Design an enzyme around this catalytic site. Structure first.
Site, PDB file in Angstrom:
ATOM      1  N   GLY A  38       0.801  -1.230   0.000  1.00 30.41           N
ATOM      2  CA  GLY A  38       0.000   0.000   0.000  1.00 30.41           C
ATOM      3  C   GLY A  38       0.825   1.267   0.000  1.00 30.41           C
TER       4      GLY A  38
ATOM      5  N   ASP B  21       4.384  -3.308   7.685  1.00 27.10           N
ATOM      6  CA  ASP B  21       3.244  -3.235   6.867  1.00 27.10           C
ATOM      7  C   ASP B  21       2.327  -2.076   7.358  1.00 27.10           C
ATOM      8  OD1 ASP B  21       1.369  -3.783   4.851  1.00 27.10           O
ATOM      9  OD2 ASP B  21       0.784  -5.751   5.636  1.00 27.10           O
TER      10      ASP B  21
ATOM     11  N   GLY C 239      -6.545  -3.301   0.265  1.00 30.99           N
ATOM     12  CA  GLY C 239      -5.784  -3.254  -0.980  1.00 30.99           C
ATOM     13  C   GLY C 239      -5.670  -4.641  -1.591  1.00 30.99           C
TER      14      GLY C 239
ATOM     15  N   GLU D 165      -0.045 -11.067   3.489  1.00 35.39           N
ATOM     16  CA  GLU D 165       0.343 -10.242   4.665  1.00 35.39           C
ATOM     17  C   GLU D 165       0.311 -11.010   5.983  1.00 35.39           C
ATOM     18  OE1 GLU D 165      -2.334  -6.911   4.211  1.00 35.39           O
ATOM     19  OE2 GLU D 165      -0.898  -5.959   2.849  1.00 35.39           O
TER      20      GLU D 165
END
Lengths: 237, 235
Positions: free
Chosen positions: A32, A88, A104, A110
């Protein structure tokens, strides 16, 4: 204030790199617009020699492409892999450091990379910080199979804590969005905070057809939140 | 084994498959004759207004080619009856499936069904514990798969196991859902079966696994003497 928001993203991102990332580390890279500046900084420091022997594992194909253009060394998640630090972003975070992620589209990789790291640092501008209950600012994503996805959604809606939700399959350009892992995502929406948070995660994850969901519980070690006034709040487990 | 497959497949269709049903279609070499037989009966007129949902792309094509009416698993579909094979079944009628690669869709279709009917031959019936006759499949992401396997080996019931990533024609098998499968092999019966189920399923990067617990209503087991044993769990 768009340049402002960018600056605030930049600030937390540079801080995570400058203060936590060290030479000869393996680093998990989130996804992102906040994380963008993490890539920027790591490449910057690597080119200057301030950092060396840093290899990264990307949490999306978007992140992998961006990193490869910059020239940041990349590896892959193998049995020998252990990541020192993952950095992150998040879509929401509370004061317990529990997160809503995945808007996203990168939630599954993730979570895998973050759970595979010694340290998870979550970075955000102060709009990500939600102090009156998780789940109300937007989508709570859940990655589900394409095959039979409407049936999977009907089954999710039985979960007592989700029975009241609205939801929308995720779309991009009037096409159903396809993930890196070739799944779909359904966004569940909450008007009140998500109840029995850990039980919900468990019941979602136990669902046939569910790959994973965007709720990260007891995974965040550090959060850096950049506030409008210049400050950066550091939060620790 | 083939005429033994034929007989349970025909029995299954003839004795449970009715007109006006939505039918879950399994995958594999026994279920090939379910297909064959459903074709026959729609075409004869003996059956009608039966529509099917396939548990693999393989089953879809074969059925699409026979002229079997196909539909998809929609918001409130109820499947009247799924018919599938199995790799192992025990006397609780718990199963190990997915040696043909289709465990995930099979599981979702079967759970969406009012009745699951499992067919197979004598060799599938496992009376001395589950999980020793071959692969116990775990569907996993292609991304970071070696790491998902490592995390599966943390589970106290899997710790010991031999395991091997699934290959076919010299390459890592890719499932209809675009995943990998890791196969676990046991030399004793799988311990604490339900716990194991749960801990696999809860694993980050696991899509699903081939252990099917408390989901089978009826099994038809073809015997070498030509007879069929029917097992029926009300429970």
């Amino acid at each position: 204030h768009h340049h402002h928001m960018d600056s605030l993203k930049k600030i937390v991102a540079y801080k995570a790199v400058d203060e936590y990332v060290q030479s000869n580390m393996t680093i998990g890279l989130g996804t992102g617009s906040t994380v963008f500046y993490v890539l920027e900084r790591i490449d910057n420091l690597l080119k200057s020699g301030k950092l060396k022997d840093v290899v990264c594992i990307p949490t999306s194909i978007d992140t992998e492409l961006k990193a490869r253009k910059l020239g940041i060394p990349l590896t892959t998640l193998e049995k020998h892999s252990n990541i020192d630090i993952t950095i992150d972003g998040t879509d929401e975070i509370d004061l317990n450091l529990n997160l809503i992620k995945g808007r996203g589209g990168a939630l599954v990789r993730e979570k895998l990379v973050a759970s595979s790291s010694s340290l998870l640092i979550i970075i955000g501008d102060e709009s990500k910080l939600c102090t009156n209950g998780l789940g109300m600012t937007g989508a709570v994503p859940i990655e589900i199979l394409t095959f039979g996805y409407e049936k999977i959604i009907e089954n999710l809606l039985k979960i007592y804590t989700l029975k009241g939700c609205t939801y929308k399959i995720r779309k991009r350009n009037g096409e159903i969005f396809i993930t890196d892992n070739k799944n779909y995502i359904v966004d569940f929406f909450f008007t009140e905070p998500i109840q029995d948070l850990l039980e919900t995660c468990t019941r979602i994850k136990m669902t046939t057809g569910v790959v994973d969901h965007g709720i990260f519980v007891n995974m965040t070690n550090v959060a850096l939140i950049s506030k409008h006034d210049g400050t950066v709040l550091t939060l620790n487990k």
